[model samples]
Structure formats: C-alpha cells, structure tokens
Target: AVLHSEPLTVMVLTATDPFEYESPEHEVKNMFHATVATVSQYFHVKVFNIDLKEKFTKNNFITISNYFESKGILEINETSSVLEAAPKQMIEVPNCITRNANASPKICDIQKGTSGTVFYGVFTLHKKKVKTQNTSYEIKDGSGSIEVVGSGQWHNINCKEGDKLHLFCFHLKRERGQPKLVCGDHSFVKVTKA
Candidate 1:
C-alpha cells in the first residue's frame, strides 16, 4: 500500500563543472534519454538550469516539466511552456533570496541547490481577503504552510478558500519574517478544484 502525502516530482537539472562527476552530466543524460525512450522510442531528453555552466534556457525547463507532468512526476499546480503558452517574456528577481533551497517543503530535507528543485504538491488557497500586497494567502499542503505574495498578474486571480493549486518555478524567501512564495513570469499557478 502507498500513501500520497504530497505530489511526486522529478527535478531534471544538470550540474556545474565542479559538481559534475566525471562525465556524469553525459552519463545521466544518456540514461535518462534511454529510460524515457524505453517507454517510447521517440522520447527525447533535454535539461536547463542556472546551475549548469551554459546553455540554460527557461523554455526548455518548462517543456521538461510538461513531460514530467505527462508521466505523473511533477504534478500539482503544473504549467505548460509560456513561450509556447502566450509568447511570455523573462521576469525579474531583483528582490529575493540567495539560494532557493529551503523554499519548498518537498526539498526542505534534501541537499542545498539540488536539481533546480521541482516542488510538486497541492496548496489550498487560504484566502485572507484574496491575494496581493495588503492581503496574502496561507497556502497549506501535505508539507506545511507558506505565505505566498500574489501580486501583479496574480492579484486578481478568481479563486476560493479551499481551491487547491499547483506551483511551478516559484521561489521561497525565508530570510524575512515568515517564509513567503513568489511566482514570477516563468512560473505559474494551476488550480485544481477540490
């Protein structure tokens, strides 16, 4: 018997030259491609993250997340590629944390800066006068609660109190008072009505 405490996530990210274990990037790439291909000979493997030395593209990462969703890996508030979604642009992180390690409850116990960390879980939309600056939400999942600062485009998101949502590409800021979540342009919130 298995129990689903939180959504499953397969964070696909490469390593830096310093962290890359003697062609591990190549090895993992081949293995992942081959494994995913086993299910379908046409499956192709691709990865992108800031941790990598080069060739980091957000669009590729979003596409990978899409494949993960198809495999039921990175589930929850999932999203499709914005470049393919609505011709989106790059957002900013001028005001945020140093490392996005302690952001999600899923990777809270794992090593810091591990695999660009995809947090797959459902967070209930605990409305405190809705979303925005003056009001914030207490999004709680199987892991725990984290205040999400929903502003700009997310301010007027029509949602209910118990509405469960999936999060992607969001960062967690804990250096401040309470741990808060910020969803940027590359990120998205997928609502799952419970």
Candidate 2:
C-alpha cells in the first residue's frame, strides 16, 4: 500500500524466515534483536532497531509516515519499530488494542471500520484436496492459529509440506462458531521453505 521514491532491497519472505514481514500497509514486524543486531549494512534499509526480543514475535518491527523518517534510496532508522503497513494505511499488529481477542479485530479497530485484513504468517495445514471441493490450510504467528480457505490456486503456488506462506489481501469472517480467512481478490500468497 506504500510507494517509495526508488528501489529498496526488499526482503521477499519465503516459507522459513517468512515471519519477518510487512502487511498491505507500511508496518514491519517479527524482527528479532538477535536478528536485527546482525544486519550491519542495513543502514540503507527501511527497518528500525527497536528492542523487543522478549515481546510478541508476530507484532511490531518498525514504521514511518512522514518522509522525514526514510531519507534515502536505501534506508534504515537508528531505532526499531513495528506494526502493519497498509497498502493504503499501515501500523503493526501489536499496537492493536481493545481487540475482541486478537489483532484482526483490532485491525478493524484501527482501519476504517474494515472487517477483512492483510495477513503474514505460517501454515500448518495447506491441503489442496481432501476429497473436498475447496482448498484449505491453517496458519499461526505464535499467538494463535486459524483455519483458512484458499482461492484454489494455492495448490499451484509451489507450497510444499513445510512451507510458510506470505499472504496479503486476505480477509477474515466469523462462521457459526469459528473465524476463517478467505483468499480475497487482493490476496497474494507466496511460499517459502526456509
């Protein structure tokens, strides 16, 4: 949801290290201190260096709105930050508050009363076929796991048994007693086996 003045050394998340990521907006999260502390040449990257080694790995990495933050083609702020990066608007999930239970509800709380949201996490179950009509999977970000439905194209996405999914434009809904995600129109899915 964000645009840059030039090309950045974008980190395309795959199945293994897929947790370190951004959302539809501009927020970045799941970066570890042990991880960021090791990035020496990152002075030009868009990431910040916040200390949350013991905090939620699924939330907060860093972010920026005012151009004063990111000043170069390659950017890296001295401090670390986190949250969601709205392709339109952005912030980290940890900043979510008064949530019904987790961040998505709070996502609606922060977003313009929007229900569905962008997601970035891991898949435990991605079954293309189970003698069923639709494809399905389960994902978690350490906080919890939720069952999800795919656009049927997931089976062709190079996802293997131990792949992590970098998903965006995904939507959420409440069923009779459960909540599920739909691979919506804007949803993007990529696989990583790391």
Candidate 3:
C-alpha cells in the first residue's frame, strides 16, 4: 500500500549566473539558497549546481551517480530512457478546468472559454467504483470538475467521500466533434494501489 502523505524528495539542477556574482563559489552558494526558497513550497528540494570552473572529473560523476542510484532515482542522462521504460505515476496538468455538459458522447469541454494560464493539477489514485460505463472520475479546481475516463485500464477503486482520483491527461491529435481525453500507449501514469 502506498501512503498518500509520504514526503517526496526532488533534486533540481540549475546554473548560477557568473556575471552577477564576484566569485564562482559565492555565486553557487547564493544561487542554491535562492533556489531552495523558490522550490520549498512544492517539494523537499535539493539543488545540485555544477560548477563550470571545476574540471569534470570521472570521480565526481561517479560519486553523484552513485548517490542518486542509492536513492532509487535515475541520473539526468538516463531520464529519457527511464521515462521510455514505463509510465510514471505522477503527472502535472496545467490550466485544467471543467465543462457543463454531463453524459454527452462528448464529455466536458476543456478548451472552450478560459484563459490558458498554467495551473498545477495532480492525478491521484482513489477508491471509488464508477457505477456507470459513461461515468468517469472527476477532478475539480475552483473553476470546475473535469470527468476522466479510465477506459479499460486497471485502477484502484476503493474511494470514500473526499478521496481523490488520479486522472492523467495527455494531448493527442484532436478530432472534430470528438471529446478529447488522454490516450495512447505512453499516455498513462502508473498508479500503485493504496
């Protein structure tokens, strides 16, 4: 079983502006502190700044790689390959809003009448059994709720009141007169049952 409130640790890689600082060491220190302040809200953030002044030694790469590997996290170079290996459980959908119509062949219309500012939304696993075929799990922001269909995919359906559902949306080619939903082979996030 997965814990909902489990802390997530994320390492961010960024560079410092050399022109803004007196020395490389000072620049890296200031940049790290600034980055930590910015990312503190969203994640348990750790920043790794690669100092360009320092030579790229094989030992340094090995040490960094080993550290992340021990934590079960992949190195930056392996990110694409890791993503290609399997669907990840967590996905962020920005500027998501709901539509009015319910039960139409075309479900909620997402891109109709709202400013497309990016808003962060998460796909969570819930324990609710959908009673109807056309019915889908819905996620709501202050704007509205968007219905999410699982299609034939396997999901955990043991939800109670106030439980959240993980609804990952991926953009595919839009067809006229058809409801747009997340689809395709790589268009899913893996959800472990809680």
Q: Which candidate ranks first by lDDT, i.e. highest?
A: 2
Clashing pairs in 1: 77-166
What TM-score does prediction 2 earn? 0.37
Error of 2 at 89 (Å): 20
Cα miss at 173, model 3 (Å)?
A: 8.6
lDDT per residue as tens, model 2, 81-187: 33333343322222123131222322222223234544433354444433255566655543455666775554345555546765544566666646677775334
What is the C-alpha local distance difference test score of each model?
0.38, 0.39, 0.28
Off by over 4 Å in 3: 1-110, 113-120, 123-135, 154-156, 172-180, 189-194
RMSD in Å for all candidates: 17.2, 13.2, 18.6
- TM-score list, all predictions: 0.39, 0.37, 0.30
Model 2 residue runs over 4 Å out of place are 1-115, 121-132, 155-157
What's the residue-level lDDT of 46 in candidate 1? 25
Q: Residue by residue across 1-194, what tens digits does model 3's lDDT show?
A: 11122223222222222212123234323111101111122111111332421322211111122112212112222111111111242223221211111112212345342332111124333224465543345544444444444443423344544554433223322346433343322123333343
Off by over 4 Å in 1: 1-120, 131-135, 175-177
Taking the tens digit of each residue's C-alpha lDDT, what string does model 1 give over 31-80?
11111111111221222222332322222222223333332232211132
